[PDB]
Amino acid sequence: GFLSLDSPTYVLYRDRAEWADIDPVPQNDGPSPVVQIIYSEKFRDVYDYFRAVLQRDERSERAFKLTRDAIELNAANYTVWHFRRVLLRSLQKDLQEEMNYITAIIEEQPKNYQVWHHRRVLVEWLKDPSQELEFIADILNQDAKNYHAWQHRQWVIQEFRLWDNELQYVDQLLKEDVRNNSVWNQRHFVISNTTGYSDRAVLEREVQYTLEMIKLVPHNESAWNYLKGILQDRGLSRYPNLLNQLLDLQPSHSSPYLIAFLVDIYEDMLENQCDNKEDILNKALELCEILAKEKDTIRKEYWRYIGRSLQSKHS
Amino acid sequence: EPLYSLRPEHARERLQDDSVETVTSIEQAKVEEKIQEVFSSYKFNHLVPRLVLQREKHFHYLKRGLRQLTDAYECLDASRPWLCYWILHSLELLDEPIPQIVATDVCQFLELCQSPDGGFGGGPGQYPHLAPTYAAVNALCIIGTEEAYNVINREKLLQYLYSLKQPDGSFLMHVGGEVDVRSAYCAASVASLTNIITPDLFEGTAEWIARCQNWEGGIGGVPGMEAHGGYTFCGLAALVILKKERSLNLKSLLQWVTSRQMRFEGGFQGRCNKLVDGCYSFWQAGLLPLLHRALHAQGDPALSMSHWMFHQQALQEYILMCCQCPAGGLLDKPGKSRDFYHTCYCLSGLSIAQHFGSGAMLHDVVMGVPENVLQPTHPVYNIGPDKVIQATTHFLQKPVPGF
Numbered sequence: 001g002f003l004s005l006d007s008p009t010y011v012l013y014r015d016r017a018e019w020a021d022i023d024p025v026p027q028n029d030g031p032s033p034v035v036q037i038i039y040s041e042k043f044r045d046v047y048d049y050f051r052a053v054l055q056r057d058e059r060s061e062r063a064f065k066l067t068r069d070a071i072e073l074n075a076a077n078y079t080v081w082h083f084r085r086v087l088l089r090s091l092q093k094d095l096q097e098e099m100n101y102i103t104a105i106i107e108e109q110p111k112n113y114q115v116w117h118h119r120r121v122l123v124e125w126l127k128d129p130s131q132e133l134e135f136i137a138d139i140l141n142q143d144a145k146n147y148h149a150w151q152h153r154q155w156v157i158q159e160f161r162l163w164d165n166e167l168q169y170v171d172q173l174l175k176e177d178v179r180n181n182s183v184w185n186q187r188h189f190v191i192s193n194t195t196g197y198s199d200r201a202v203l204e205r206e207v208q209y210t211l212e213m214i215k216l217v218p219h220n221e222s223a224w225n226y227l228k229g230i231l232q233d234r235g236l237s238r239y240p241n242l243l244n245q246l247l248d249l250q251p252s253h254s255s256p257y258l259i260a261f262l263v264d265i266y267e268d269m270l271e272n273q274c275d276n277k278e279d280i281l282n283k284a285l286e287l288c289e290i291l292a293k294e295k296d297t298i299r300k301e302y303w304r305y306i307g308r309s310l311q312s313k314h315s
Numbered sequence: 316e317p318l319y320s321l322r323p324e325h326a327r328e329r330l331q332d333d334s335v336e337t338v339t340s341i342e343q344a345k346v347e348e349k350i351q352e353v354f355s356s357y358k359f360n361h362l363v364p365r366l367v368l369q370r371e372k373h374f375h376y377l378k379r380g381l382r383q384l385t386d387a388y389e390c391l392d393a394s395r396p397w398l399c400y401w402i403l404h405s406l407e408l409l410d411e412p413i414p415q416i417v418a419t420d421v422c423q424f425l426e427l428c429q430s431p432d433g434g435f436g437g438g439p440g441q442y443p444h445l446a447p448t449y450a451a452v453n454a455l456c457i458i459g460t461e462e463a464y465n466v467i468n469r470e471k472l473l474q475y476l477y478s479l480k481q482p483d484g485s486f487l488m489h490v491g492g493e494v495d496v497r498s499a500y501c502a503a504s505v506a507s508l509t510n511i512i513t514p515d516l517f518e519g520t521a522e523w524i525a526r527c528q529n530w531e532g533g534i535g536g537v538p539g540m541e542a543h544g545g546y547t548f549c550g551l552a553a554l555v556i557l558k559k560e561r562s563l564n565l566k567s568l569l570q571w572v573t574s575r576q577m578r579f580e581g582g583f584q585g586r587c588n589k590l591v592d593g594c595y596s597f598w599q600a601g602l603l604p605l606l607h608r609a610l611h612a613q614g615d616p617a618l619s620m621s622h623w624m625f626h627q628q629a630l631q632e633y634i635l636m637c638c639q640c641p642a643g644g645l646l647d648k649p650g651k652s653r654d655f656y657h658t659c660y661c662l663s664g665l666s667i668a669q670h671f672g673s674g675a676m677l678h679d680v681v682m683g684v685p686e687n688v689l690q691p692t693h694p695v696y697n698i699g700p701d702k703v704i705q706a707t708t709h710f711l712q713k714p715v716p717g718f
């Protein structure tokens with residue numbers, strides 16, 4: 001029987017008949033305490049009883065149910081999580097019922113690290129990733145940028161080779177929010193681990209899609225960072241058309257992002273013995289000054305550093 | 316006017332959503348409107364802007380929290396050495412001394428947190444974990460007495476680190492726990508401070524951290540993950556300790572971190588297209604001195620001789636105007652409640668933004684009243700530079716445990 005911690009008829013463990021045999025163990029905070037938390041009666045009660053069962057290493061059904069309350073009170077207590085995992089194995093607990101429980105607590109506390117690590121352990125134990133992608137998609141439906149949800153998703157996909165529908169899921173979330181950086185990261189994760197970006201048709205499709213996204217939302221930094229990230233590998237100067245194609249967006253779709261990208265192309269050209277070296281240098285230096293003084297003054301120190309760096313190297 | 320965030324041209328820094336609204340732009344616009352109300356309050360109330368760090372209010376909040384906390388802190392019952400570190404470091408930045416009785420009570424409490432098998436747990440009798448191990452070592456080093464140094468069981472600490480070490484170069488946060496870039500930093504920080512680095516302890520670690528640098532230029536928690544300020548600081552700081560900063564593409568990292576400063580708010584966001592947050596004042600801005608040191612070691616001639624590569628003024632303005640709780644303590648952004656974590660990191664980031672250093676060169680930028688000047692902080696350890704030298708020199712008298 002599960003007496004919920006929030007139930008109106010919840011009773012402190014010290015008032016429970018089935019717990020009378022055991023003395024709760026108080027926390028030893030020393031004689032002159034520091035960072036001492038004045039625990040609520042409910043918290044102190046559960047934790048003094050958790051300490052008793054832990055200290056005596058009681059691998060019982062009652063100790064198992066108690067870890068659920070200790071976790072609900074403080075889901076970041078990794079000592080409790082460890083003992084709960086000892087009890088799951090010692091007591092031979094049904095791991096699918098434990099999956100139902102972890103699903104419920106992750107829904108309640110989706111930013112807690114311990115809950116996600118526990119779910120990974122259960123998936124490993126059961127060798128069953130079948131509910132994973134759908135469960136994660138439900139968390140991502142509430143917070144599309146939840147870092148642990150994306151990390152658990154990449155772990156599941158990589159460990160169980162569930163690559164096949166991920167690019168489609170990425171396309172769906174990018175339609176919902178083109179500015180979702182976690183999703184542009186997922187796009188790179190899928191492509192790099194499947195076809196790779198060396199395949200010319202793949203690269204062309206990716207750059208075209210990104211340029212279309214930049215046209216629709218010019219001030220969306222994620223698409224600009226993605227375009228740079230997928231082309232910086234081989235070097236921006238390796239793509240001669242790109243420069244003129246971005247210059248063709250200078251009046252209509254301009255931003256400090258387009259200007260900064262132009263400086264990035266110029267830096268690579270100067271590092272790869274480009275034609276018209278002094279012309280490229282002055283163009284780059286002009287943009288560094290426009291960025292530092294007018295269009296991106298928050299980054300004045302970076303842009304001045306770049307200007308000085310370019311001068312020092314390509315004078 | 317003399318404040319960058321209050322200049323008429325600063326209005327041009329507001330979000331441009333291109334008439335395409337998404338959850339991201341909507342949430343950003345809400346934050347910007349709230350920050351604009353803060354920036355304009357002086358204009359609307361017909362008062363001369365005065366930027367004052369509320370030292371006495373922050374001091375009261377901290378001296379009290381060091382001894383006792385309400386049940387609102389139950390969520391941090393497995394993070395008690397973090398509370399010691401956050402509070403002791405905030406008091407250190409505010410140039411507040413530690414009474415010898417307090418220093419002794421902290422030492423004794425951390426002794427109770429120390430595991431018989433090495434490392435520290437989040438509280439008395441809790442299992443050891445690298446995050447409270449890092450916090451406990453940092454707190455003991457801020458105290459810096461013989462008693463504090465003697466608390467650390469160096470032989471078991473090394474044993475503990477070896478037990479977490481993975482064949483791929485990574486470290487578990489704890490036994491039966493997970494791997495992330497924070498663990499490499501926690502291990503490198505405690506191991507370097509206590510002089511327990513053996514020749515093979517960090518074998519493959521630099522290479523594993525370098526695998527966490529992604530297409531964005533920043534560092535993810537594990538390989539494949541989105542670049543994040545907290546992990547990027549952990550990754551670069553651990554590589555500085557190991558003298559392996561070169562394993563990263565430093566230029567793509569420099570471009571990524573500088574891009575994280577918000578043109579409007581002046582503070583830093585944790586990742587691209589997410590919100591400004593006062594704690595990133597340390598995690599993100601703290602990367603600039605580390606990058607400065609790394610590039611200088613490569614003999615970069617184009618580096619500044621007076622400023623870090625971020626807007627030191629705009630960051631101080633964001634912290635001073637938006638991150639102070641009137642009752643004392645600091646916070647993420649206006650509307651959020653104070654906590655000791657944000658108090659520690661807002662103040663850590665303020666110190667970094669105030670103090671530039673590179674070899675012979677020393678240059679301060681103190682926004683508002685001169686009393687706002689904080690004690691400097693070490694960009695690798697986030698404890699006072701004097702505490703770093705004192706601890707390192709002390710532990711270097713001891714041989715590396717022979718096993």
Ligand SMILES: C/C(=C\COP(=O)(O)OP(=O)(O)O)CCC[C@H](C)COC(=O)C(NN)C(F)(F)F
Nearest residue numbers: 147446497500543545546549585586589590592
């Ligand atoms: C996944 C995540 C945040 C996303 O959280 P959320 O989405 O709510 O935030 P945002 O991304 O801003 O929207 C955590 C990584 C960042 C932490 C600050 C890491 O912490 C440290 O560096 C250390 N310690 N405690 C230490 F190094 F000391 F160990």
Ligand SMILES: [Mg+2]
Nearest residue numbers: 078114117492
């Ligand atoms: Mg854990």
Ligand SMILES: [Zn+2]
Nearest residue numbers: 592593594647
């Ligand atoms: Zn924060």
